[PDB]
């Protein structure tokens, strides 16, 4: 997915942008409906195209390891 960077930037930089952006663009399960329809709206902003649930979450992932802890306690 980091093919836009051409032959520039080097392995590490574009390997990370690809991984991060790949997981960012993945189908995400909405906390409301449960449908895989959550898409990134901005930095840390997520929204379900199905039920319109707009919520906060990681900058590139809807859920972060730290966020998944808040529940358990």
């Amino acid at each position: 997915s980091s093919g836009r960077f051409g032959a520039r930037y080097g392995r590490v930089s574009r390997r990370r942008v690809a991984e991060i952006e790949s997981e960012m663009n993945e189908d995400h399960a909405c906390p409301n409906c449960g449908e895989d329809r959550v898409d990134r709206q901005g930095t840390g902003i997520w929204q379900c195209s199905y039920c319109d649930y707009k919520f906060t979450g990681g900058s590139y992932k809807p859920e972060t390891p730290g966020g998944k802890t808040v529940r358990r306690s």
């Binding site: 709206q41 930095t43 840390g44 900058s59 966020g67 808040v70």
Partner: protein
């Protein structure tokens, strides 16, 4: 010589100032007399230009509309509470005394009623540990154990936008844009690449500091550069 870059800063000229007129809102804890009876519905989620993180728009019962330091997992429609009796859920804000031990907290107050000071940046969080009638021990994001007044308010949960710093900027342009939203002069010219007239490390036939980098704490501004009161340097040892 001439005043170094760090000295031009303090003057507060446009170049060094933050784009305050472009910032949305000062995210401070709402005030309540007592009793808690205060709740609001999240009407929207916005982007905060001053912190590169999501901030939630809330509308309280008394018809009060204000932006809030949004934790992770706060959606539109969600009902938030603020007060002593505020339900122990993510997004709610109650004094540390009412917050259970071992629970991740964000936007922690330094002194009760200040509106929150600690743990506000993307994805971080404080950690409430010890309880008492006098002091609530919080473990701040830097790892420091901070003893606080149990009456200091603080939101439950971790701050939204976590993991932001995990992706590299890749190019100067990306930094450029982020920098334009902060009170920071960028790019950065190494002192070693300047003239002696401009910086303590300036001058010489080849670039290298003409003295050791570790400077005394008592050094005057204009000379306090490099490694300030470094307890040590390097990785080894």
């Amino acid at each position: 010589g001439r005043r170094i870059q760090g000295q031009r800063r303090g003057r507060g000229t446009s170049t060094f100032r933050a784009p305050s007129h472009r910032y949305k809102a000062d995210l401070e804890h709402r005030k309540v007399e007592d009793g808690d009876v205060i709740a609001g519905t999240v009407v929207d989620i916005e982007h905060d230009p001053a912190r590169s993180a999501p901030v939630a728009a809330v509308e309280f019962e008394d018809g009060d509309r204000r932006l809030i330091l949004a934790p992770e997992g706060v959606g539109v429609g969600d009902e938030l509470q603020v007060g002593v009796s505020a339900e122990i859920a993510p997004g709610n804000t109650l004094p540390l005394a009412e917050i259970p031990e071992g629970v991740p907290v964000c936007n922690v107050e330094s002194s009760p009623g200040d509106g929150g000071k600690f743990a506000r940046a993307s994805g971080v969080n404080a950690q409430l540990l010890t309880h008492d009638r006098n002091v609530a021990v919080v473990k701040l994001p830097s790892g420091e154990m901070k003893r606080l007044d149990p009456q200091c308010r603080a939101t439950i949960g971790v701050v939204a936008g976590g993991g932001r710093t995990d992706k590299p900027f890749v190019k100067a342009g990306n930094k450029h844009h982020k920098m334009k939203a902060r009170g920071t002069k960028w790019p950065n010219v190494r002192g070693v690449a300047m003239n002696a007239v401009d910086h303590p490390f300036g001058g010489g036939g080849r670039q290298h500091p003409g003295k050791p980098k570790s400077i005394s704490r008592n050094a005057p501004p204009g000379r306090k550069v490099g490694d300030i009161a470094s307890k040590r340097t390097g990785r080894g040892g």
